[PDB]
Amino acid sequence: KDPLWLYKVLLTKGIEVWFDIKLEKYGIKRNNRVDYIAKSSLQQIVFEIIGKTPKNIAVPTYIGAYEPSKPEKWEEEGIKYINLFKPTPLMKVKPVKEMPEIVKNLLLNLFDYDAKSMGLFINWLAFIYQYKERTGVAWIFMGKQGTGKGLLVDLLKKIFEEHMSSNITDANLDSQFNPYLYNKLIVHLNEVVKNRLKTWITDETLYINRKNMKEVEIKNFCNFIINSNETIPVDIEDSDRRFNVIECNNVLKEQEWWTTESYQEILNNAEGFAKYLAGIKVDRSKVNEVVMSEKKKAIVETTESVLKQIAKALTDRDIEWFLDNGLEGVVEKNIVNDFQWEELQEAITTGVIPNKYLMIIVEQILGDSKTITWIKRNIITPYQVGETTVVKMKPIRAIVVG
Amino acid sequence: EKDPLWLYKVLLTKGIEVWFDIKLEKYGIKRNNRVDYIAKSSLQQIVFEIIGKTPKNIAVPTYIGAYEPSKPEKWEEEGIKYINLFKPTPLMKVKPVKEMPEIVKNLLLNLFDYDAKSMGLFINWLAFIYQYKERTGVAWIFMGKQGTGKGLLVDLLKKIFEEHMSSNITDANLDSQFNPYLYNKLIVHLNEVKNRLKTWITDETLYINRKNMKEVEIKNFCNFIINSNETIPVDIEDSDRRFNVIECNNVLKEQEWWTTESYQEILNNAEGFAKYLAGIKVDRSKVNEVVMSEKKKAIVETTESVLKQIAKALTDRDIEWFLDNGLEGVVEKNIVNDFQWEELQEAITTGVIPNKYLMIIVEQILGDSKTITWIKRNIITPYQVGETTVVKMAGKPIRAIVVG
C-alpha cells in the first residue's frame, strides 16, 4: 500500500532508517548517532519500538555520504543521498571573541610565545572547525615530552568527538582495516609510511576497509596532526607544500602556571576553546600556508642526500658549499699543491672538472676514495650534472657542467 | 506484544538482565557480576531453560554497552541509552584495613629493597587504580633478575582484579590481530613496540578487535605494569613522564623468611592485600608522579644518541663533558701540541671551533675520522648547534662553526 509506512512511524519517534545499497546495510540515525546494522538487528529494534516485527522493512533507499557542507538529504544525477555527518555538541556552539586563559597558556607554551605560527595554526584549526574541509597541510609537533602535545590532542578530541582519530600508531597501520580514516576531520598520528602519509594529506578518495563491512571508496576529509619525540620524524623535501613544523622544549611541570589539575582544567575548558574557534574570522588564503621554520630547514638538510648536494653544488659552481664542507683540508693534508689547489677550485667555479680533480673533490667530501665510474653513476649521471668529455686544458678527460 | 519489554522483566525476576547492543549487534547478558555478548540463537536457548518457551521476538531493550566505573548501571547521554559493563570483582567491594598482611609486606619490601618512598609511591599508584578506577598515565617497570617476586606480585593483583587485569601479555598476543587484553581492563601486565606502548599509557580510546565481534573504539582504562630481565628493557627519553623504574636483585629463596609455602601463602592473602589498598589514603598529586631513579637515569643515558650528547656539549660549551669522555687522549697520542690543546678547549668553551679542531674533537669521541660534511649532517645541523661560517682569528680567515 505505502512502502514507506515504517519509515514514517519511526520518524515520529525521532528515528530515521534507510537502506544503503552501497554497503548493503540499513542505516539508523538517532540523537546525533548514525549506525549501520543488518536487517535482523534492525528488526529487533523496531519490535522494541512498535511491538511487531515487520517481515518487510518499509524504508527508503538512500546512499549514505559524509559531507558536512551539505543538507541532511540532497540528490545529484538522480541518485538520492542522506548525510552521515552529524555535528557533535561542541561544534554547534555560540562564538566567543577570546579563548579561556589556561587554554591560551597551553598553546603559547607549545608555540613558545610566537604569535605568527600560533595564530596560523589556530586559523588552520578554525577553518577545519567551521568549514570542515581537507586542508592539504599537516602540523608536526615535536621536541620533548610533557610539553602539551598530548593534551592539545585530547583537548581537540573532546571538541570533534567521533570525527577525530586519537593516537593512531603503527599498530593500527599494520591492521588490515582503515577505521581511523573513515569520516574524520582530524587524524592524529603518534611518532610517525614516508609516502603513505604524504599522500593522505592531499587525497580526495581513500579505500576504506572496516571489519564486517564492504571495502568502499569515500571522499577524504582528514587533516593530520603529528606528534613525535624523535629528532627527525619524517623526510621533508625542500620544495614541500604539506608540513608545518613546531618544536617545543618547554616542559609543562616546570612552568609558573602549572598544577597537577591543570591537565584536567584545560580539558574541562573544551567548551570555551570550541567557542573561541567558532568565532575566528578565517583567512582562507592561509589555511594551506606552510612556513619554512629553521627546524623544518634543519629536517630537510639532514634528510636530503649528500650526493644530491654535491651534484647541485657542482651544478651551481658553488665553491662556497665545498669549503663549508671542508674542501680546504685537501691542501693541509698536501693532497694538492698550492698551484693545483687553485686549479681545483677554478674547475669547480668554471664548471669544467678534470677526472683527476673530480676524484679529489668527492673523496674529500665523502671521506672514501671513489672511482670515476662510481662518481658518474652516483653523482653525475642521475642528477644530470654534465657530460664526461675530452677538454683541451694536453687532452684532459673532464666533466663539463651544463 | 502487549509490552515489548515483557521478557526483559521476567528475566530480571530471576536476576538476569538482557539487552540488545546496537553497537556490536549482539545481545548482552549480565549475570552475577559477569557480562557476555551472545548471538540471538544462543540467548533463545538460555531463556528456554529459564522460562520453558522460545520467544520468536526478543522483548528486550536496546542499549549501548559501555565500561565506565564512574557511572550508574544504566544512564543516558543525549538521547542514547547506555548500560554499564563494569561490575566490580568481590575483592574490590571489601572493607578496608589500616595495615597490610605481614607476608605480603615482606614481598614488597623485598621487591623495592626496603625503600619506603618508592614502595609507598607504587602502593599509592595501586590504591588509586583500586579506589578511583581511572587511567593514570604512568607505568611501572620492574627489572633485574629472576625470583625477586615480580611474577608473584602479578598473580596477587590478578586475584584482586580478576577480569579487569591482563596477566603475562607477551609477544604472542601482540602479534595476534586481536586486542582482548586491552578491552575493559584497569591493569595490563606485559612480560619482557616502544611507541605502540608509550601511546597506550596516555590514550583515551583504543580500537578493540576481538574474535567474533566488530572492531569498535572504546574508552581506555589501562594502567601498565612491565616486567623484564633485560638490562635495557625500553628506550626512555630524559624528559619522560610515563615510566617509573624499579630494579630488584633480591631473590626470594635466599631470604630468611621464605619457605616453600610462602608463594601460595602470599597468594592466599589476596583479600588482606585488597583491604589494605581500599584503606590507603591516596595522594593524587603523586599518582602521575615519576621519579628518575639511578636505574632510570642509566636507561636514559644508555639510550640517547652520542651525537645528541656531543651536540649539546657543543651547545653548552661544556669542556668537562668532552674530557669526561677522554678528549685529552688527543694529547697523549700527540695529535696535538701543548698549545692548540689550549686553543681546542677554548674553542669549545668560546663556542667558536675551527674546522681543524672540530674534526679532531669528533674523531677522538667517536673513534673514527669523520668529515666536516658528516659532522654537519649528523651533529651540527639536526641539533641546531650553530652556523658554519668564515671567522677571522689572528690573521688567517679560518673556517669555523659558531655555536649559538
Residue numbers in the entry:
A (entry chain E): 305 to 496, 507 to 707, 710 to 718
B (entry chain D): 304 to 495, 507 to 718
The authors write:
NrS-1 polymerase is a multidomain enzyme and is one key component of the phage replisome. The N-terminal Prim/Pol and HBD domains are responsible for DNA polymerization and de novo primer synthesis activities of NrS-1 polymerase. Here, we report two crystal structures, showing that NrS-1 CTR adopts one unique hexameric ring-shaped conformation. Although the central helicase domain of NrS-1 CTR shares structural similarity with the superfamily III helicases, the folds of the Head and Tail domains are completely novel.
Totally, two NrS-1 CTR structures were determined, one in A-form and another in B-form. The A-form crystals were grown in P212121 space group; per asymmetric unit contains six copies of NrS-1 CTR monomer, which were assembled into a ring-shaped architecture. NrS-1 CTR assembles into ring-shaped hexamer in both structures. The helicase domain forms hexameric ring in both A- and B-form NrS-1 CTR structures. NrS-1 CTR forms hexamer in both A- and B-form structures, however, as confirmed by the size-exclusion chromatographic analysis, NrS-1 N618 exists as a monomer.
